[PDB]
Structure formats: structure tokens, C-alpha cells
A paper describes a structure:
WD40 proteins are a subfamily of propeller proteins with no intrinsic enzymatic activity, but their stable, modular architecture and versatile surface have allowed evolution to adapt them to many vital roles. By computationally reverse-engineering the duplication, fusion and diversification events in the evolutionary history of a WD40 protein, a perfectly symmetrical homologue called Tako8 was made. A different computational approach was employed to redesign Tako8 to create Ika8, a fourfold-symmetrical protein in which neighbouring blades carry compensating charges. Tako and Ika are the first successfully designed eight-bladed WD40-repeat proteins for which structures have been confirmed crystallographically.
The high symmetry of the Tako protein is evident from the crystal structure, and determination of the space group proved challenging (Tako8 crystal No. 2). In both crystal forms the Tako8 molecules show a conserved interaction at the top side where two proteins meet face to face. The crystal-packing interaction is mediated by a hydrogen-bonding pattern with eightfold symmetry. The difference between the two crystal forms arises from different water-mediated interactions at the outer rim of the toroid. The individual repeats of the Tako8 protein can be perfectly aligned. In comparison, only the alternating repeats of the Ika proteins can be superposed, in contrast to the template structure where the overlap of the individual blades is much poorer. The symmetry is also visible in the electrostatic potential map, where eightfold and fourfold symmetry can be observed for Tako8 and Ika8, respectively, with the exception of small differences owing to crystal-packing inter­actions; such charge symmetry is absent from the template protein. Tako8 was found to have highest stability around pH 8, but to be extremely unstable in the absence of salt. Increasing the salt concentration led to increased stability over the tested pH range.
Author numbering: 2 to 320
Write the structure that this text describes.
């Protein structure tokens, strides 16, 4: 069931992230909007971007967004003003992640750039990729980046060098997740690969998808991936076997998220689907979107989804 349909975005919503009392949405209208999830009304419209917003991340005080204008901006989430503009990328910024000290941005110019968040200076520039960087993730020591060059590269977050290059994918890498033990990468070649992060060798290749893999997520036991073949698949990470295939969507799966109990997926068929992961059976179909679903996020009881119809919708996860 839909509770609140947030409105005021004039173009497709690309990214979102919500807490207990606010939602932060990025869209193709070059604006970032802050809303009150309870009332469903807009508080602040963050302006300064000259093209579509591709990703975002916020904490209690700060919002960090990436846009198609090759800039990463840092916003005060309460006053609505822009604090820093980070300039160094020469093409669209596709992914971002930031902590207390630094921000890390991936771009179409095949470079990952590290910036000390309170300075705005370009600390490091990670060179090595031959095409657009699509996804990234870093911890205290290292950075793992995916790119259109069909390779996943590991870097040292402070030395600025490349540690390993994970090779085997025959098409662009779209998503990645990693721990100190392994990395998990999805690619356009319809395969998900599990690698040993320490040595950079391929531990397994998950096969079964008939088209590009768009999103993934894994815990200690399982990998959950969504593909362009309108299906979500469950895998066993150590075995490499296919566990369950979730079938209900009639178009490509774009975003997903899961826990020990359920799997919440978004697709281009304008529907968000909640499934019991143990069964592999659909529990609900969230309807109300008039166009493709681009991003989602859920907690214990509600789901927040963004769609191409320039709307952000809140859903009761099981009501």
C-alpha cells in the first residue's frame, strides 16, 4: 500500500536515501530535494547542479551528491546551502561514498578521485581504468572500483596506487560489494563473479542470468542479484550454485535490497516486488508508479522507491 507520494521533481528520480524522519532524493532535473517522510512534503530544494543528479549520500549534517556536470557537491542538510563544489572530473560522476574525513567519487573519465571532505582539495586521482567508472566502495584502507573496461580494480586509499586488477568479465562492470575476504561483482556479460580480494583471483562465476546484471547484494551466506532478464536470483556464495529465481517482473530489474526475511526489488515494469526469500515466492506487488523504478530502500516496515515518473513513493512493506 502507498502512504505518501512525494511530488515536485520535474524529471526522473535517480537516487534516494531516507532515515527516520527525512528522505533525500536526486533527480534528472539537477536538483536534490529533502522531504519529511511522515507528512510527505518538501522542505529544501538543493540547487547548484547544471545537469542530472546521479547519486547521493547524507548523514546527520551533510549531503553529498554527484551529477552529470562532472561535479560533486556538499550540502548542509538543514540550511539548504551548498558548502563545497569539488571540481576535477571532466565527465559525469556516476558513484560516490564519503565518511568523516574524505569523499570518493567515480566518474565517466575513467578516474576515481579522493577528496578530503573539509578541504575540497583533490587529494588523489586513481588512474588505471580505460573507460567509465560505474561503481565504487571503500573502507579504511582500500578502494574497490568497477568500470566499463570489464575490470574491477583495487586501490590503496592513501597511497593512490593500484593493488590488483580483477579480470574475467567480458563486459562492463555495473555493481560491486566487498568485504576483507572477498569481492562480488556483477557485469553486463550476465555473470556475477566472486573474487578473493587478497590475491585478485576468481573464486567462482555465478551463471544463469540471460542478460546484464544491474544490481547485487550479499551477506555471509547468499548473493542476491537482479538482471536485465526481469528476474532476481539467489546464490550460495561459497558453493556458487543457484538457489532460487524470483519471477514476476516483466522488465529489467534495476534496484534491490534484502534481509534475512525478504527481498525487495524494483524493475522497469513500474512495480516494486517484495518476496519471501526462503520461499522464492512473491508476497506483494507495489503498484502506483507510471514508469520504471530506478532506486529503492526499505527498513522494518516501510519502503521508499524512486521512479522515472518524477515521483518518490512510500510503501507499507507488508500492509
Amino acid at each position: 500500500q502507498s502512504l505518501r507520494t512525494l511530488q515536485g521533481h520535474q524529471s526522473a528520480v535517480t537516487s534516494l536515501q531516507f532515515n527516520d524522519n527525512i528522505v533525500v532524493s536526486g533527480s534528472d532535473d539537477s536538483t536534490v530535494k529533502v522531504w519529511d517522510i511522515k507528512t510527505g512534503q518538501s522542505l529544501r530544494t538543493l540547487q547548484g547542479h547544471q545537469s542530472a543528479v546521479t547519486s547521493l549520500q547524507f548523514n546527520d549534517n551533510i549531503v553529498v551528491s554527484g551529477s552529470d556536470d562532472s561535479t560533486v557537491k556538499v550540502w548542509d542538510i538543514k540550511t539548504g546551502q551548498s558548502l563545497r563544489t569539488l571540481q576535477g572530473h571532466q565527465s559525469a560522476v556516476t558513484s560516490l561514498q564519503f565518511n568523516d574525513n574524505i569523499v570518493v567519487s567515480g566518474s565517466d573519465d575513467s578516474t576515481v578521485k579522493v577528496w578530503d571532505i573539509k578541504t575540497g582539495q583533490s587529494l588523489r586521482t586513481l588512474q588505471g581504468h580505460q573507460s567509465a567508472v560505474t561503481s565504487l566502495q571503500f573502507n579504511d584502507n582500500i578502494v574497490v572500483s568497477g568500470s566499463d573496461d570489464s575490470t574491477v580494480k583495487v586501490w590503496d586509499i592513501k597511497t593512490g596506487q593500484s593493488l590488483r586488477t580483477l579480470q574475467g568479465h567480458q563486459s562492463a562492470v555495473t555493481s560491486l560489494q566487498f568485504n576483507d575476504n572477498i569481492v562480488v561483482s556483477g557485469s553486463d556479460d550476465s555473470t556475477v563473479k566472486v573474487w578473493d580480494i587478497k590475491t585478485g583471483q576468481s573464486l567462482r562465476t555465478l551463471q544463469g542470468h540471460q542478460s546484464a546484471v544491474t544490481s547485487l547484494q550479499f551477506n555471509d551466506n547468499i548473493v542476491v542479484s537482479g538482471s536485465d532478464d526481469s528476474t532476481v536470483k539467489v546464490w550460495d556464495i561459497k558453493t556458487g550454485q543457484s538457489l532460487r529465481t524470483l519471477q514476476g517482473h516483466q522488465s529489467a530489474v534495476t534496484s534491490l535490497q534484502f534481509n534475512d526475511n525478504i527481498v525487495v526489488s524494483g524493475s522497469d515494469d513500474s512495480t516494486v516486488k517484495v518476496w519471501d526469500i526462503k520461499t522464492g515466492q512473491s508476497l506483494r506487488t507495489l503498484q502506483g508508479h507510471q514508469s520504471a523504478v530506478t532506486s529503492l530502500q526499505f527498513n522494518d516496515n516501510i519502503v521508499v522507491s524512486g521512479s522515472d515518473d518524477s515521483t518518490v513513493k512510500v510503501w507499507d512493506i507488508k500492509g
